[PDB]
Design a protein around this nucleic acid. Sequence first.
RNA 1: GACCCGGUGAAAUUGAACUGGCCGUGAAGAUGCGGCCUACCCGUGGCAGGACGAAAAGACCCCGUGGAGCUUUACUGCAGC
RNA 2: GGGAUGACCCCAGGCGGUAGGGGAGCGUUCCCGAUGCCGAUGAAGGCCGACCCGCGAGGGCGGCUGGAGGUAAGGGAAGUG
RNA 3: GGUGGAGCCUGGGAGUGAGGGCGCGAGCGAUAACGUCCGCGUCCGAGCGCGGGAACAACCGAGACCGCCAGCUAAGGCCCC
RNA 4: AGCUGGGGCUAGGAGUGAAAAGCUAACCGAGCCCGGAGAUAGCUGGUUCUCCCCGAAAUGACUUUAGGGUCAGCCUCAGGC
RNA 5: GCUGUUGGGAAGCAGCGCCAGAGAGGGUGAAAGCCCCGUAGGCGAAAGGUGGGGGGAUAGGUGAGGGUACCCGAGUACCCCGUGGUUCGUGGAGCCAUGGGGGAAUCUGGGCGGACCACCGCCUAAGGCUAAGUACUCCGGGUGACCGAUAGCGCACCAGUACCGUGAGGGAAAGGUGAAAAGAACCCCGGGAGGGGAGUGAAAUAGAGCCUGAAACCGUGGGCUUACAAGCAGUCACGGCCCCAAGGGGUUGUGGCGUGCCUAUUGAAGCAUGAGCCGGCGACUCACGGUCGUGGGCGAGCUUAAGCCGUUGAGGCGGAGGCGUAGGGAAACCGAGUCCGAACAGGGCGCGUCCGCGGCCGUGGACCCGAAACCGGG
RNA 6: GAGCCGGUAGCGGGCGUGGAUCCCUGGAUGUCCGAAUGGGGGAACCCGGCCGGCGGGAACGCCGGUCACCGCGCGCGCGGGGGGAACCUGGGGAACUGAAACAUCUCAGUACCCAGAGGAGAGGAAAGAGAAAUCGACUCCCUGAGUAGCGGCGAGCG
Lengths: 100, 146, 51, 63
Amino acid sequence: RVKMHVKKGDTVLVASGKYKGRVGKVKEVLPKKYAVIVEGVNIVKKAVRVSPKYPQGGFIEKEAPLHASKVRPICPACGKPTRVRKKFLENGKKIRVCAK
Amino acid sequence: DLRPNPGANKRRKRVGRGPGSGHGKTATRGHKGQKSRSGGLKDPRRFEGGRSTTLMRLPKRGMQGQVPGEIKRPRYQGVNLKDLARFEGEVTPELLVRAGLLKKGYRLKILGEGEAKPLKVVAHAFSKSALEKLKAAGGEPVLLEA
Amino acid sequence: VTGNELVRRAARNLPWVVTLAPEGLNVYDIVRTERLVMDLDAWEVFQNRIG
Amino acid sequence: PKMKTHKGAKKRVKITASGKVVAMKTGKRHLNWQKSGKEIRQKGRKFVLAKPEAERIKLLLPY
RNA sequence: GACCCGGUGAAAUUGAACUGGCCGUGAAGAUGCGGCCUACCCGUGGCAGGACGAAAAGACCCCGUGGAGCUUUACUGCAGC
RNA sequence: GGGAUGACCCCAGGCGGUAGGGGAGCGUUCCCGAUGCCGAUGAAGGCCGACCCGCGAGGGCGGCUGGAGGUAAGGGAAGUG
RNA sequence: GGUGGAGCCUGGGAGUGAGGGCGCGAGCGAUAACGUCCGCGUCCGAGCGCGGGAACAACCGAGACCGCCAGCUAAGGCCCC
RNA sequence: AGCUGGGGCUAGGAGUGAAAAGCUAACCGAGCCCGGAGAUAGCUGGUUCUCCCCGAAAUGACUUUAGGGUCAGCCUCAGGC
RNA sequence: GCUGUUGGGAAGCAGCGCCAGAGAGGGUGAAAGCCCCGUAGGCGAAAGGUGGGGGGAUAGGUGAGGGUACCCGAGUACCCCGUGGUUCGUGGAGCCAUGGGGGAAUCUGGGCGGACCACCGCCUAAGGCUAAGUACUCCGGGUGACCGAUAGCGCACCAGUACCGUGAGGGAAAGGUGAAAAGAACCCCGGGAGGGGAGUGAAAUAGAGCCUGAAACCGUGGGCUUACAAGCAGUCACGGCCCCAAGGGGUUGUGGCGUGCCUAUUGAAGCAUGAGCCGGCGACUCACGGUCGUGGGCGAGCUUAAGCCGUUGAGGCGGAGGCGUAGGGAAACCGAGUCCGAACAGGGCGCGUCCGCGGCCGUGGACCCGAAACCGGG
RNA sequence: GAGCCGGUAGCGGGCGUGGAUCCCUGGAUGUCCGAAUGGGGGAACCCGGCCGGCGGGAACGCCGGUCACCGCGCGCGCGGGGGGAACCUGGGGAACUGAAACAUCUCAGUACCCAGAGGAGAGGAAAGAGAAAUCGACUCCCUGAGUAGCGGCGAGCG
Ligand SMILES: [Mg+2]
Ligand SMILES: [Mg+2]
Ligand SMILES: [Mg+2]
Ligand SMILES: [Mg+2]
Ligand SMILES: [Mg+2]
Ligand SMILES: [Mg+2]
Ligand SMILES: [Mg+2]
Ligand SMILES: [Mg+2]
Ligand SMILES: [Mg+2]
Ligand SMILES: [Mg+2]
Ligand SMILES: [Mg+2]
Ligand SMILES: [Mg+2]
Ligand SMILES: [Mg+2]
Ligand SMILES: [Mg+2]
Ligand SMILES: [Mg+2]
Ligand SMILES: [Mg+2]
Ligand SMILES: [Mg+2]
Ligand SMILES: [Mg+2]
Ligand SMILES: [Mg+2]
Ligand SMILES: [Mg+2]
Ligand SMILES: [Mg+2]
Ligand SMILES: [Mg+2]
Ligand SMILES: [Mg+2]
Ligand SMILES: [Mg+2]
Ligand SMILES: [Mg+2]
Ligand SMILES: [Mg+2]
Ligand SMILES: [Mg+2]
Ligand SMILES: [Mg+2]
Ligand SMILES: [Mg+2]
Ligand SMILES: [Mg+2]
Ligand SMILES: [Mg+2]
Ligand SMILES: [Mg+2]
Ligand SMILES: [Mg+2]
Ligand SMILES: [Mg+2]
Ligand SMILES: [Mg+2]
Ligand SMILES: [Mg+2]
Ligand SMILES: [Mg+2]
Ligand SMILES: [Mg+2]
Ligand SMILES: [Mg+2]
Ligand SMILES: [Mg+2]
Ligand SMILES: [Mg+2]
Ligand SMILES: [Mg+2]
Ligand SMILES: [Mg+2]
Ligand SMILES: [Mg+2]
Ligand SMILES: [Mg+2]
Ligand SMILES: [Mg+2]
Ligand SMILES: [Mg+2]
Ligand SMILES: [Mg+2]
Ligand SMILES: [Mg+2]
Ligand SMILES: [Mg+2]
Ligand SMILES: [Mg+2]
Ligand SMILES: [Mg+2]
Ligand SMILES: [Mg+2]
Ligand SMILES: [Mg+2]
Ligand SMILES: [Mg+2]
Ligand SMILES: [Mg+2]
Ligand SMILES: [Mg+2]
Ligand SMILES: [Mg+2]
Ligand SMILES: [Mg+2]
Ligand SMILES: [Mg+2]
Ligand SMILES: [Mg+2]
Ligand SMILES: [Mg+2]
Ligand SMILES: [Mg+2]
Ligand SMILES: [Mg+2]
Ligand SMILES: [Mg+2]
Ligand SMILES: [Mg+2]
Ligand SMILES: [Mg+2]
Ligand SMILES: [Mg+2]
Ligand SMILES: [Mg+2]
Ligand SMILES: [Mg+2]
Ligand SMILES: [Mg+2]
Ligand SMILES: [Mg+2]
Ligand SMILES: [Mg+2]
Ligand SMILES: [Mg+2]
Ligand SMILES: [Mg+2]
Ligand SMILES: [Mg+2]
Ligand SMILES: [Mg+2]
Ligand SMILES: [Mg+2]
Ligand SMILES: [Mg+2]
Ligand SMILES: [Mg+2]
Ligand SMILES: [Mg+2]
Ligand SMILES: [Mg+2]
Ligand SMILES: [Mg+2]
Ligand SMILES: [Mg+2]
Ligand SMILES: [Mg+2]
Ligand SMILES: [Mg+2]
Ligand SMILES: [Mg+2]
Ligand SMILES: [Mg+2]
Ligand SMILES: [Mg+2]
Ligand SMILES: [Mg+2]
Ligand SMILES: [Mg+2]
Ligand SMILES: [Mg+2]
Ligand SMILES: [Mg+2]
Ligand SMILES: [Mg+2]
Ligand SMILES: [Mg+2]
Ligand SMILES: [Mg+2]
Ligand SMILES: [Mg+2]
Ligand SMILES: [Mg+2]
Ligand SMILES: [Mg+2]
Ligand SMILES: [Mg+2]
Ligand SMILES: [Mg+2]
Ligand SMILES: [Mg+2]
Ligand SMILES: [Mg+2]
Ligand SMILES: [Mg+2]
Ligand SMILES: [Mg+2]
Ligand SMILES: [Mg+2]
Ligand SMILES: [Mg+2]
Ligand SMILES: [Mg+2]
Ligand SMILES: [Mg+2]
Ligand SMILES: [Mg+2]
Ligand SMILES: [Mg+2]
Ligand SMILES: [Mg+2]
Ligand SMILES: [Mg+2]
Ligand SMILES: [Mg+2]
Ligand SMILES: [Mg+2]
Ligand SMILES: [Mg+2]
Ligand SMILES: [Mg+2]
Ligand SMILES: [Mg+2]
Ligand SMILES: [Mg+2]
Ligand SMILES: [Mg+2]
Ligand SMILES: [Mg+2]
Ligand SMILES: [Mg+2]
Ligand SMILES: [Mg+2]
Ligand SMILES: [Mg+2]
Ligand SMILES: [Mg+2]
Ligand SMILES: [Mg+2]
Ligand SMILES: [Mg+2]
Ligand SMILES: [Mg+2]
Ligand SMILES: [Mg+2]
């Protein structure tokens, strides 16, 4: 509904914060909190588990949601918002112009 | 000009005076102070004291209306023939209340004082001095009886 | 103040134009802006509207 | 709302042109009072004073 | 029970109080005003004389052009007859 | 009254105040001014201030606290103290 | 004679219609009451804000715009407090 | 004329009462709850910022009126004289 | 709409741009027209509701004449008695309804035009239907000189809930970590809770019913001060002592002087009333009229109302009407006069609105609180 | 049109660019109570009859239909019954209040109760209005107008 947004599980630039400009991979959309996770915010989760298994070695702990109004998608371009081209039967996301 | 100062020229008097006070209308809620001005008084134009306050007067104004009411009678407005004299032409109703006087009700009784212009008024009643005034300059016809 | 809606559309959307119909002239929308530009077919309706 | 004119004060009080208020003098009233003697002559038409300021505030709209 | 110690620990009341006694005085019954006289600061257990102590916006009286209950050969109705 | 207006400048009086009447103002919320101007080089708010301006209501400035809103001069409407 | 928050008139807004002490003139009372009812005031009311009266609304002195670590005074005092 | 469990009836100017005006969901001379209803209150309480000016009355007439009100007296504001 | 910048973070600042039929708003780590959602504009319905707004047909409608007095709504009209409705309260009481009683005619009928009667009119009762415009707001949407958690609904939250009540019914409080849970791994004390480290984060006196977090209150540390003192708790004066070093503030030792606040009062420190303290909520408004003032407009003119047409927080059209221009009189009526009167004595009375704003008044609940009660339905 | 399996955070369990999750529209199933409606009932439960179905079985069971009552026409069939924040019409209808007491009056045909009805209701085509050789259904809004009037001719209503 309103909950649909920029893009889906592809590679995408983030222009947010500390990671102002970082091309991350496939992004794993959240989106009820309107975020993705993609590759940027990598903050440490100081948690054991809920089920006590394979205990604490190091923390290379996982990512964070990264609110999705700052993940600029990519094509042979940089940024350039998505658009809709329909071609009489489909609905494809073509950027401000390069292609694709 | 701009929205800074077109503002009203120094006289609005709008201290719409709230008596929330301690200085101003000092806390007995200016004018008040005793009791029986505590949320109401009865008139005090017709009213009290409780004596008559004036019913000791007496209705001379008779023929005060049998139950169907005022007979829907003609009522002649009275213009002076000096206030008729502001214009020129065949002065008639609708050179009247179309412009100015007579307030639309029933037809016209010119009367009065002033410089009778020579012009033939089709009025619908006359005072004797108005007739004697404008026959001394002009003429007039009379009412409609159609 | 134009009686041409296809320039009211053009000037509808600026930080410094209050667009206006030729009949909707009013002193508040006059005074809240610093300039006034009106058509001949808005000045004619304004001149015949007022005395 | 729409301040009602006192019909009693209309029926027993006349508002003049310049602002006074006139009524019958009291005591002639079919007499209930006495025999003759020029008081019934002098029951003509007075005008009340400083009671108009409490009385013209009743009769407003049809004078 | 009260009193001491250990535990939990309310209340009505409360203008602030750093709250003595007497003669006066003051809205006419004062810790607070004046004069004097006592009087180190702070408790604990008590007795209750005062703080016009608390409690109940007197329950008696009066006023309300209040309100009810009730009565009747008050007035006027209505039921009923 | 003096004024070669700029009515600032002096002069003679007055200036306790309840109910009240009258005149000036200061504030709070909201709005026009505002698609503006301020504001993370820290907003409203909070704590202070021995400073500043105002007779006062209050307003400024400075210091921390606060971590994101505030809204000028002139005006308007109050759920205004 | 009297230029005074004097008057007269019109209009707006009232408040007030529980007053009290003292003096004088009286009534009622008992030639009693900080009694009650008037008249002429006055003062408190609202001036107890101040001084004296030991204290103390109305007794005596006096009408408090604010300040001053200046002065002269009223009632009252001048041995001390 | 016993007491008591169960099942039931009677309800607001009505029930019920070996009668006290008692009882009727802990306060019954007419239950409680909602609604008219923000009843009414000539009564008591209370009325919220600041400054400046002027400043009363508690009297008369009339009141089913005496703690209230109308008018005049005293007060203020503006205008004219 | 990209870069650089301080920053935790940029959209802030700056440079170089661009769109605009879109510079309404929201969120984005803050301050974004150009990142997102959007908005302007424009598309979209297979299925269902919807709808003459647009055209289609149906059903129905098309004794103009002159006559033989056929029929025109029956316990009805009309009359009386009893009442309700309308402005109508018994009044001069019509009319419209109709509970009782008497009781007709069908067009030379019958009713009405305010007792009634006669002329002149008006109109057809005793059978029924009839869109539209109007009231409403559980509902959906937008709009706010509307509220921002005691406000707004009683409920922003799992609220008509807990709780009270047998019951009808009453009926609460209770929002906010941060950007993101990264919501604290691992130690150490402790049984645990809670801490202290470590870690997160810009910030952890932002650490979990957690933003800001005031005050009352309760502590701890420091300065001054008190155990021969007396007081509505202060104030003025000096003096002593630590803070700043000119002058200050903090303390208070002594002296001088001092009867709290509000209300009600003839008077209150009052041993009259209210107040434990603090924080919030809390009481002169508003609608329509009126009376005076003032700022304006117009000015013997003034002036819109409902409604109509149009918007973007564009307003015009609308003169129906209302005031005002002449008043007297009860009224006919007369008129710069009128009336009382026989009177050409005398005397009584004899010339602006529309807004805004304010004082005040009227009806409104009408400044707010509070009755005992009354009545209806349960 | 790429994520989902509601307010999921956890079992990890699956499911989706051959189209899911969602949203809308149309069906289907809708237990039981409720107008409750087969009868009873102390609502959400009991107890049935007839027909048709499962030693699962003739007895107790369970399933799926149908079984209230009233109104309209020819045993036969189409409606009605209850609910709804207000809005409206009709049947009833107070009292405190105001009159500075109060009874007529006012409050008020208000509140409330009942019935009915619908997106509106009401009313409605003249046995009208009342001064015009006039208007021509009804309703609503503004004027008329606080007028005409009514009125213990008070209060006020209008
Ligand atoms: Mg497709
Ligand atoms: Mg106030
Ligand atoms: Mg009083
Ligand atoms: Mg008094
Ligand atoms: Mg009397
Ligand atoms: Mg533009
Ligand atoms: Mg008129
Ligand atoms: Mg112990
Ligand atoms: Mg007490
Ligand atoms: Mg002591
Ligand atoms: Mg002692
Ligand atoms: Mg004593
Ligand atoms: Mg002593
Ligand atoms: Mg003392
Ligand atoms: Mg004792
Ligand atoms: Mg006691
Ligand atoms: Mg008492
Ligand atoms: Mg009485
Ligand atoms: Mg009784
Ligand atoms: Mg009788
Ligand atoms: Mg003064
Ligand atoms: Mg005053
Ligand atoms: Mg503000
Ligand atoms: Mg800036
Ligand atoms: Mg603010
Ligand atoms: Mg600050
Ligand atoms: Mg500061
Ligand atoms: Mg400002
Ligand atoms: Mg308020
Ligand atoms: Mg308020
Ligand atoms: Mg009196
Ligand atoms: Mg007296
Ligand atoms: Mg005196
Ligand atoms: Mg005395
Ligand atoms: Mg005296
Ligand atoms: Mg004597
Ligand atoms: Mg004496
Ligand atoms: Mg006495
Ligand atoms: Mg005096
Ligand atoms: Mg004095
Ligand atoms: Mg003294
Ligand atoms: Mg003394
Ligand atoms: Mg002085
Ligand atoms: Mg000397
Ligand atoms: Mg001397
Ligand atoms: Mg028994
Ligand atoms: Mg039983
Ligand atoms: Mg009984
Ligand atoms: Mg009992
Ligand atoms: Mg009783
Ligand atoms: Mg009862
Ligand atoms: Mg009440
Ligand atoms: Mg009522
Ligand atoms: Mg009071
Ligand atoms: Mg003075
Ligand atoms: Mg009285
Ligand atoms: Mg007076
Ligand atoms: Mg005077
Ligand atoms: Mg005056
Ligand atoms: Mg920074
Ligand atoms: Mg924003
Ligand atoms: Mg922030
Ligand atoms: Mg933005
Ligand atoms: Mg569009
Ligand atoms: Mg279709
Ligand atoms: Mg179709
Ligand atoms: Mg339809
Ligand atoms: Mg017929
Ligand atoms: Mg018969
Ligand atoms: Mg008849
Ligand atoms: Mg009559
Ligand atoms: Mg005939
Ligand atoms: Mg007839
Ligand atoms: Mg007729
Ligand atoms: Mg007739
Ligand atoms: Mg007639
Ligand atoms: Mg219809
Ligand atoms: Mg309509
Ligand atoms: Mg919404
Ligand atoms: Mg707000
Ligand atoms: Mg808001
Ligand atoms: Mg809250
Ligand atoms: Mg709330
Ligand atoms: Mg809060
Ligand atoms: Mg809830
Ligand atoms: Mg219970
Ligand atoms: Mg956040
Ligand atoms: Mg722990
Ligand atoms: Mg806390
Ligand atoms: Mg906090
Ligand atoms: Mg200490
Ligand atoms: Mg000693
Ligand atoms: Mg010592
Ligand atoms: Mg002392
Ligand atoms: Mg001292
Ligand atoms: Mg002293
Ligand atoms: Mg004092
Ligand atoms: Mg007094
Ligand atoms: Mg006394
Ligand atoms: Mg006290
Ligand atoms: Mg005491
Ligand atoms: Mg007491
Ligand atoms: Mg008292
Ligand atoms: Mg003008
Ligand atoms: Mg049009
Ligand atoms: Mg004359
Ligand atoms: Mg006004
Ligand atoms: Mg009654
Ligand atoms: Mg789930
Ligand atoms: Mg599908
Ligand atoms: Mg599917
Ligand atoms: Mg689904
Ligand atoms: Mg099935
Ligand atoms: Mg059943
Ligand atoms: Mg049954
Ligand atoms: Mg059962
Ligand atoms: Mg088988
Ligand atoms: Mg078988
Ligand atoms: Mg069956
Ligand atoms: Mg059919
Ligand atoms: Mg029904
Ligand atoms: Mg009554
Ligand atoms: Mg009454
Ligand atoms: Mg009475
Ligand atoms: Mg009525
Ligand atoms: Mg209809
Ligand atoms: Mg009908
Ligand atoms: Mg017809
Ligand atoms: Mg009408």
